[PDB]
Design a protein around this nucleic acid. Sequence first.
RNA 1: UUGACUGCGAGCGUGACGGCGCGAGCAGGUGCGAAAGCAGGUCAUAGUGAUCCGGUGGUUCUGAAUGGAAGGGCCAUCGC
RNA 2: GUAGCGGCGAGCGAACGGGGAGCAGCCCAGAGCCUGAAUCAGUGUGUGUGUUAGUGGAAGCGUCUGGAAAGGCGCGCGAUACAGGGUGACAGCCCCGUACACAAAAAUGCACAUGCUGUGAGCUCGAUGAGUAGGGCGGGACACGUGGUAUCCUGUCUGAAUAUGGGGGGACCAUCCUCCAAGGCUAAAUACUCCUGACUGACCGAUAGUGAACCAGUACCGUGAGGGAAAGGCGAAAAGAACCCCGGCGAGGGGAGUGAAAAAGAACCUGAAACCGUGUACGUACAAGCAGUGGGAGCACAGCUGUGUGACUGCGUACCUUUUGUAUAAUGGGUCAGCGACUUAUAUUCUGUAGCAAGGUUAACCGAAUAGGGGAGCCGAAGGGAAACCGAGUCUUAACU
Lengths: 117, 144, 64, 201
Amino acid sequence: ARVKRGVIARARHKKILKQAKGYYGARSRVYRVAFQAVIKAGQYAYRDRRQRKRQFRQLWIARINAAARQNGISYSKFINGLKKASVEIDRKILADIAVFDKVAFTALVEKAKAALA
Amino acid sequence: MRLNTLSPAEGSKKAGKRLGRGIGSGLGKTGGRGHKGQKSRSGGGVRRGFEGGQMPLYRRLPKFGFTSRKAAITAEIRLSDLAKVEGGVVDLNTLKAANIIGIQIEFAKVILAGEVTTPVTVRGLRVTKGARAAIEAAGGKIEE
Amino acid sequence: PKIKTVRGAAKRFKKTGKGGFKHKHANLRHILTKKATKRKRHLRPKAMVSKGDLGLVIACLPYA
Amino acid sequence: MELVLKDAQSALTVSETTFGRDFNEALVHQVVVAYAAGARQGTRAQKTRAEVTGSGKKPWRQKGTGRARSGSIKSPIWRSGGVTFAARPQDHSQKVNKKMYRGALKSILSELVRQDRLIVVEKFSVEAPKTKLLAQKLKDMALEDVLIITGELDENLFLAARNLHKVDVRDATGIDPVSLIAFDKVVMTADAVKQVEEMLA
RNA sequence: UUGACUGCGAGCGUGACGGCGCGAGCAGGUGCGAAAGCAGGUCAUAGUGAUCCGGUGGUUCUGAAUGGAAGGGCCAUCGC
RNA sequence: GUAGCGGCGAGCGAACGGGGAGCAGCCCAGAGCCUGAAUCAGUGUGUGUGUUAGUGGAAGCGUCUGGAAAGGCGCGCGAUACAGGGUGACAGCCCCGUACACAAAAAUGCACAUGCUGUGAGCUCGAUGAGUAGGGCGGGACACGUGGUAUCCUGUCUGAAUAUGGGGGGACCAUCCUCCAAGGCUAAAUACUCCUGACUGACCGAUAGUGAACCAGUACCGUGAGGGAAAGGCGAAAAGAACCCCGGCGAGGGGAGUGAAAAAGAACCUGAAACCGUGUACGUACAAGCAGUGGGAGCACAGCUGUGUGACUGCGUACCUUUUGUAUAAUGGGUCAGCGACUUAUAUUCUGUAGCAAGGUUAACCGAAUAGGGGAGCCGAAGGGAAACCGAGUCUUAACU
Ligand SMILES: [K+]
Ligand SMILES: [K+]
Ligand SMILES: [K+]
Ligand SMILES: [K+]
Ligand SMILES: [K+]
Ligand SMILES: [K+]
Ligand SMILES: [K+]
Ligand SMILES: [K+]
Ligand SMILES: [K+]
Ligand SMILES: [K+]
Ligand SMILES: [K+]
Ligand SMILES: [K+]
Ligand SMILES: [K+]
Ligand SMILES: [K+]
Ligand SMILES: [K+]
Ligand SMILES: [K+]
Ligand SMILES: [K+]
Ligand SMILES: [K+]
Ligand SMILES: [Mg+2]
Ligand SMILES: [Mg+2]
Ligand SMILES: [Mg+2]
Ligand SMILES: [Mg+2]
Ligand SMILES: [Mg+2]
Ligand SMILES: [Mg+2]
Ligand SMILES: [Mg+2]
Ligand SMILES: [Mg+2]
Ligand SMILES: [Mg+2]
Ligand SMILES: [Mg+2]
Ligand SMILES: [Mg+2]
Ligand SMILES: [Mg+2]
Ligand SMILES: [Mg+2]
Ligand SMILES: [Mg+2]
Ligand SMILES: [Mg+2]
Ligand SMILES: [Mg+2]
Ligand SMILES: [Mg+2]
Ligand SMILES: [Mg+2]
Ligand SMILES: [Mg+2]
Ligand SMILES: [Mg+2]
Ligand SMILES: [Mg+2]
Ligand SMILES: [Mg+2]
Ligand SMILES: [Mg+2]
Ligand SMILES: [Mg+2]
Ligand SMILES: [Mg+2]
Ligand SMILES: [Mg+2]
Ligand SMILES: [Mg+2]
Ligand SMILES: [Mg+2]
Ligand SMILES: [Mg+2]
Ligand SMILES: [Mg+2]
Ligand SMILES: [Mg+2]
Ligand SMILES: [Mg+2]
Ligand SMILES: [Mg+2]
Ligand SMILES: [Mg+2]
Ligand SMILES: [Mg+2]
Ligand SMILES: [Mg+2]
Ligand SMILES: [Mg+2]
Ligand SMILES: [Mg+2]
Ligand SMILES: [Mg+2]
């Protein structure tokens, strides 16, 4: 029962090379190189699902800080004020409101200031 | 019941280990041999008894005893075997015919093992004290 | 082919009922005058092979 | 236990141990596999590095050439080299305990009866050794793929069945586990049933 | 004066193992002591070497047709 | 894998006895008798029966698809033949076969029958293997390494008795049992396959399988012995491309034509990958690093989503191996494709599973039998003791609390 490997080996190589589309030079052409590239791409993607949550929160905070300071209060005091006021809106939404509805954002700032006053 | 509806019992057929077929298998690369040394090598491994050069156990202990030739031609008969002979006369030859003792056995002892219900005449064999009691209790007799 | 007994081991070990092995003690061949009688008397009877050693003995005596 | 005849519409008393036992799939499986293993011829080989034709000359010196070290043109690593673990002719036959063989047969026969695949008849014969006759007879009985087990191997019946690929004609002594399962229907003559009983006690 | 005893030993210590160590008490026979008792070497911890082969003495074992014997075993002990 | 042998190490490893296959006994060391008688042999002739060429050998049409039918569908027929091969696709019925039945002028094998020649059986009376057995010395073979070591062989030196005798029974002696050396022949069961025929394969399918599917032990290499490749596939059929055109009366190409198909056109089935191009979209000439990943505009495009691209930006030093530890400036890899490493046999132990169960199971072999026979054996149901031996006990001890 001799088994030839061609058909199965071809399929496996092709699967890796399809995942390496768009990569530079040997990385999209040559199986040895592409296999390493696709593994590394997978490792980064795993890491980056975690980092993505950090990068967005960091962005929301920076934006909230800008808008809060336009309304005469720092991020740190603003968040403290909202907590004392029992407002439970999250940073994603605050950052959204800071950009799109500045009047509503000012209302939140006033709410926060009152809770500190 | 068709040739393509028969199945082995669950657990009866375990797949063998296949070494050196990749990471996922759990037996890839070194194939369960670990790293380097004599035991990792093809044909590697030390002989039976070898303890690294320390005098092996079977050499640091003394030989003892001798082998009896008489023991080889001596057998023991259970009470349970007395019923398996033909005629109800247990002698050396009837025990052989009944495949109880080997062809080259010259001496045989009946021992207290199992039970004897029927009466049997034991002739020519040695019989233990306990076996003598059992045979006589069952109505048998022991001839010397 | 059939496994071969280590013939030297078969002259030193004998299998007992529960499947252990008995052996004779070392240190009673000679230089006996200097040894205490108590020491010698305790070396006379056969002893059982220890747990650590059984594996080795069993390997040597496949037909024991 | 009674087996209803087809032609005579009588009854036939048979052993319940033989024809009425439970189906032991694991047992039957082992015996069927063993039977197929027994059919294997096992005739093949390849050449090891010892058997490939060529000299024992070292292709190039151990050191200095910048090449991987080589010992033999016949190494299994090389094109045209030996097969690492070259096959030899093998015997694939397995032992089947006598009692497991008989146990399997009883399971199979009992299962045929439960599935109404066993048909008992008083007689089964053809006048002349003519395939046409046997073909007609089976068409009358609404049979097609059938194993026919007679007591005495009728030579006429044997010759009439030779060219019918779906039909097989055995004597009671020559029944085998795989055949019993392989065919859609099994027709046994009353005589054969008696013989099979005696054969399986 | 010969307990530097003979047969044993509940139990325990210490070793990977081979081993090494402590031990009341039991049987036999002994010494000392009026007796209770004590004694299986020495205040204790070094003073040593496995197995194989061989030697010497003993032995209610074995003894290659049988009776013996040789040789083997077992117990004691020795040698390089 | 026992008894043994064995730096009692590594290892080596019987026999007795049992079950089977097969079976067969004879002659010379010598004359008489018998007579050419058993018997085989040689050489003829017969009769069967092989082999070496051969002969006959059943039964199908319609319609649909297709380049082509043997395919689909419908309705038939043969089968002691549905093994197999071929035929424009995968055919019981088109062809060659197959089952089955027949066949030899000539040569020849084998088995029987029978002429002839040679052959001496049978009976009687004898005879009964000497530089031999044995021994000393040195070696060797026996499972046995000289050991307490029997038996066998003999290079060397010796040397019996001879049936009232002699050999062997594992030192040796006695007794008993058993056999008769120093002369020879002998079928079968057993071993093997350069070679011939037939058939078979959970054997390979062109880097496999023979080194060799092919004009291969060739080309080629070597003074020589010797070493030793690569290399298969157009199509059903050559119908293998008339003729025209560019070109050097080229190569190569474009038409035409053939064909089901010529991106089947001979560098010919399929026709992957590396590698190299042409075209289109998007990006890219102020920009620093494993080249991705997360975020992300813009542009192009197809139905707000999809697809391609990816300015800018967070994070981010390949893989394997070896190591206390490797981005390591330690190892290995130019890339792709193909191949390339825990197997097989037997024994042994444990686990799972199945059968049977104080039993379980057969080996060789017989059997046409994967059946059935075959229980020779093996393992288990009893141990203790070095052993004799005793035995649910036994050993130790004078004896055990
Ligand atoms: K596993
Ligand atoms: K392992
Ligand atoms: K080749
Ligand atoms: K048939
Ligand atoms: K048709
Ligand atoms: K086709
Ligand atoms: K055909
Ligand atoms: K001589
Ligand atoms: K070659
Ligand atoms: K083509
Ligand atoms: K980036
Ligand atoms: K490496
Ligand atoms: K290193
Ligand atoms: K280096
Ligand atoms: K290769
Ligand atoms: K196993
Ligand atoms: K099992
Ligand atoms: K006891
Ligand atoms: Mg294949
Ligand atoms: Mg692991
Ligand atoms: Mg390694
Ligand atoms: Mg290491
Ligand atoms: Mg290791
Ligand atoms: Mg090696
Ligand atoms: Mg040393
Ligand atoms: Mg027997
Ligand atoms: Mg001693
Ligand atoms: Mg050489
Ligand atoms: Mg090859
Ligand atoms: Mg059988
Ligand atoms: Mg003192
Ligand atoms: Mg004797
Ligand atoms: Mg003798
Ligand atoms: Mg025809
Ligand atoms: Mg075609
Ligand atoms: Mg002689
Ligand atoms: Mg001589
Ligand atoms: Mg001699
Ligand atoms: Mg000599
Ligand atoms: Mg002699
Ligand atoms: Mg190919
Ligand atoms: Mg080839
Ligand atoms: Mg041209
Ligand atoms: Mg077509
Ligand atoms: Mg084709
Ligand atoms: Mg092509
Ligand atoms: Mg391509
Ligand atoms: Mg720029
Ligand atoms: Mg740069
Ligand atoms: Mg970075
Ligand atoms: Mg280092
Ligand atoms: Mg690092
Ligand atoms: Mg560098
Ligand atoms: Mg490096
Ligand atoms: Mg290195
Ligand atoms: Mg390199
Ligand atoms: Mg016993």
